[PDB]
Design goal:
This protein is α+β, with helices and mostly antiparallel strands. Helix content is 31%, strand content 15%. The protein has 2 domains: 80 residues, Phosphorylase Kinase, domain 1 (2-Layer Sandwich), CATH 3.30.200; 213 residues, Transferase(Phosphotransferase) domain 1 (Transferase(Phosphotransferase), domain 1). It is globular and about 60 Å long. The structure holds 4-(2,5-dichlorothien-3-yl)pyrimidin-2-amine. The site of 4-(2,5-dichlorothien-3-yl)pyrimidin-2-amine has 16 residues, from strand 1 and strand 5. 4-(2,5-dichlorothien-3-yl)pyrimidin-2-amine (CK1) binds next to strand 1 and strand 5. Its cofactor is Mg(2+).
Length: 294
């Protein structure tokens, strides 16, 4: 776009290259995202436009949608770092619990807002959770999955991670509920605490079986209707559930209680973002300033 000065390539996004750019007219720095091929369907256009109104402090603001020469460019609010990089840079000591709680608290507020408007992310991951020097954290690319389906590989052939994918998705559910985002956030919560990914699957079955080995193979008791799902197989190995005290030490009882509810197999039983915000784990939540060195 002639109105933007591509100052730098930030990285490779799910849909295309993501650039840091400056608007010549306003002078504001933004995140420019190129999306993908035939002419862009009107459905995607209408879906994306609805996102311009989904405004919240914990959601990366969609500034503009530029469709020209049959090409789509999304203009977003720009943040200097993602949670993936921050966790890597805090590996030696791990993110202080107060900051972890603050981030989870803010993330849940963002989900609650989007979910109340029936909008899902469907592909939450450390890579699209952005933070600033003021202690805030925001969800990026919310709603794009519905507009543009999440691919197996990105334009750069990079494999889209399955680490945060909810079990109902892995089992072939055709209709996603807001519960898929709580699952993903639960996995990220566990990762911030232990400093290691919870379920680092490298294939759909490996992902599913890693979940099964930790939470126990799901059955009709804990998940009514699971055996009738598209990709469920009666031949799945039967693993017993591990205690959370072993899965996420040194998370306290409040944190483990909340995580368990965010990781419930049955999407309907899984806690909502709104109910999670009222959980005792957040009784002493604060907003610490993070140590960011840009
Ligand atoms: N909005 C924004 N701002 C800075 C970086 C990004 C970003 C860059 C990626 Cl690569 S994924 C992702 Cl999310 N988005």
């Amino acid at each position: 776009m002639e109105n933007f000065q591509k100052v730098e390539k930030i990285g490779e996004g799910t849909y295309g290259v993501v650039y840091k750019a400056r608007n010549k007219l306003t002078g504001e720095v933004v995140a420019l995202k190129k999306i993908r091929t035939e002419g862009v369907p009107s459905t995607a256009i209408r879906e994306i436009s609805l996102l311009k109104e989904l405004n919240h402090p914990n959601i990366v603001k969609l500034l503009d949608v530029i469709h020209t020469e049959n090409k789509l460019y999304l203009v977003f609010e720009f943040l200097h770092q993602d949670l993936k990089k921050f966790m890597d840079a805090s590996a030696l000591t791990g993110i202080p619990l107060p900051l972890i709680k603050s981030y989870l608290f803010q993330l849940l507020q963002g989900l609650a807002f989007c979910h109340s408007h029936r909008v899902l992310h469907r592909d939450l991951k450390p890579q699209n959770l952005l933070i600033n020097t003021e202690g805030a954290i925001k969800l990026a690319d919310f709603g794009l999955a519905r507009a543009f389906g999440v691919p197996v590989r990105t334009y750069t052939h990079e494999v889209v991670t399955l680490w945060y994918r909810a079990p109902e998705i892995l089992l072939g559910c055709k209709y996603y509920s807001t519960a898929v985002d709580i699952w993903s956030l639960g996995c990220i919560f566990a990762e911030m605490v232990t400093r290691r990914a919870l379920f680092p699957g490298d294939s759909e079955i490996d992902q599913l079986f890693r979940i099964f080995r930790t939470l126990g193979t799901p059955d009709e008791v804990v998940w009514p209707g699971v055996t009738s799902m598209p990709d469920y197989k009666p031949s799945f190995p039967k693993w017993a559930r591990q205690d959370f005290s072993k899965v996420v030490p040194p998370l306290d009882e409040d944190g483990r209680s909340l995580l368990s509810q965010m990781l419930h197999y049955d999407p309907n039983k899984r806690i909502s973002a709104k109910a999670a915000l009222a959980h005792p784990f957040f009784q002493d939540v604060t907003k610490p300033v993070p140590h960011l060195r840009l």
